[PDB]
Design a protein around this ligand. Sequence first.
Ligand code: MG
Ligand code: MG
Length: 462
Amino acid sequence: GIDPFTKYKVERNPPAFTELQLPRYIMAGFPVCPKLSLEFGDPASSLFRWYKEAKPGAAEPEVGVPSSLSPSSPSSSWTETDVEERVYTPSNADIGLRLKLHCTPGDGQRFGHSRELESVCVVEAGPGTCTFDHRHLYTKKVTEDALIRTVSYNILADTYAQTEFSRTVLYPYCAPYALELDYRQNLIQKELTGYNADVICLQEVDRAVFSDSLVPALEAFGLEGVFRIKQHEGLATFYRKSKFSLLSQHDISFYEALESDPLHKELLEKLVLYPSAQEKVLQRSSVLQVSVLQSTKDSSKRICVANTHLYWHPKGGYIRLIQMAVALAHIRHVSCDLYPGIPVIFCGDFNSTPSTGMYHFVINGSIPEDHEDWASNGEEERCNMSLTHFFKLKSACGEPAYTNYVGGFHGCLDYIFIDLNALEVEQVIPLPSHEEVTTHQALPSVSHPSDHIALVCDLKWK
Ligand SMILES: [Mg+2]
Ligand SMILES: [Mg+2]
């Protein structure tokens, strides 16, 4: 009815849902993570109730009649479930059924008007096994305050997969349905949420994947994220709110920093002696995400979390060297100048195996001017120089046989680098066995949602 006090009153914007979406793909044993954009409220104080179709086909959609959210069907075609949580995980018994979510926005003090929506898909059977199933045995609980469970994962961008070409030439061994973004995202949501991690650094994140898949899944499990585009896709970093808050951000673009920031003046002076190499470096659009996190448990503890995806080309060794030199100089500035020497975690797809110049530089703190990678793409783009950096770094998950495994290539390209003076490794969550990885020849597969393998480790302060 009419509120008779509105003439006397300036009144609140009530809690209200401003996006409500269900996944377009749903599978038994995989969490259904609704997208909720909640204004003037929070999901934690909101109400959720899940319904399932009474039996397959029972809920016939109203023809031509509009809803702004979903199809609409008779209320009597639906059965109320047990589940009053934001996330619903279907069972085998749900196979063949559509789902319906009824939710009421709240802010802890009051509720706003409820909305409801139905899935357009039915629950499907899930894969028999996934490579992360055994790994999840190690990550059943959120870690204690003394630990930082850290993930690094290149999740394979739809913008590079989705293709018929990618399907027929790069990934011909993979079931086409398992290459589909919606299938891979459902696996990725289960994978990442099951790691129960504190810091998650991702690469090859499509913008829409960030907004529609990762944020809804990970925020349901207590993590918040930030995104930085490269060109067609980019980087994401998530952190567990119960253990960290985001204190500051210091993202850079390597070409932009190298040419315009006096921090890198000495490196730039070395490179201008090599016009052709310099041109190739400054044409690259790789970026570096840097997030300084404040511990919610200990006011004295802050950590510098960096994330990157370096230049991809096999002959791009000298470019990756220069990109990492810029990254580490920038990270030194943030972690040692803007903050007085805080620990560094540096995740990424570095597109560099352990035998490369870039890797040598990282773990030794220097590289000589005569290293062969200074002519990785031939004489004209040669750029011999000696570099040094400040850090004592080690790879927390070591040097696996590979972290990227496709039909035509495999190698260790991904690392979680840590400041070994400040952090140590409590445990490494084992990568899938070679026999697991090759069950469907290579990756991705019906059982594994990327062509890379997630690195997961538990770190501790020294
Ligand atoms: Mg890739
Ligand atoms: Mg790569």
